[PDB]
């Protein structure tokens, strides 16, 4: 059809068809797979907490917030030898001080982040 851009979902990638007319009496077709990138709806934060057997009710609560760094249609710019981040999933602290926790043993030093109410 006369539509400038027609997107065809896959029957492994979405097929996007755009019509370009260099002249009035000539035109052609371009076909490009776009991204087909699906984000994990959940991140195995069991590199976050050991998932204890019992967890009490807490006034604080954490949520996995799905973010999109670039807006719908906003261009993305990438400098040489530097990649582009497109999601940047974040965790929201909703319900708070914070201070270091350092355990030492015979000179062996390691610090921790303590976020409590």
């Amino acid at each position: 059809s006369r539509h400038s851009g027609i997107l065809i979902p896959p029957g492994k990638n979405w097929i996007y068809v755009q019509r370009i007319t260099p002249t009035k009496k000539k035109f052609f077709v371009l076909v490009r797979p776009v991204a087909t990138y699906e984000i994990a709806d959940s991140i195995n934060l069991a590199t976050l907490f050991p998932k204890d057997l019992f967890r009490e009710k807490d006034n604080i609560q954490l949520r996995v917030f799905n973010y999109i760094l670039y807006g719908n249609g906003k261009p993305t710019r990438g400098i040489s030898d530097t990649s582009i981040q497109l999601v940047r999933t974040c965790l929201v602290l909703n319900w708070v001080r914070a201070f270091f926790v350092e355990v030492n043993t015979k000179g062996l030093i390691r610090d921790f982040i303590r976020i409590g109410l």
């Binding site: 979405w14 776009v34 991204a35 087909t36 699906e38 984000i39 709806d41 999109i68 261009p75």
Partner: peptide
């Protein structure tokens, strides 16, 4: 639960530049 990303190398150039590639 789905996002797309078309790769398009967009360049912005001054009117005084020289273009080595035809349209």
């Amino acid at each position: 639960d789905r996002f797309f990303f078309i790769p398009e190398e967009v360049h912005i150039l001054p009117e005084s530049s020289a273009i080595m590639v035809e349209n």
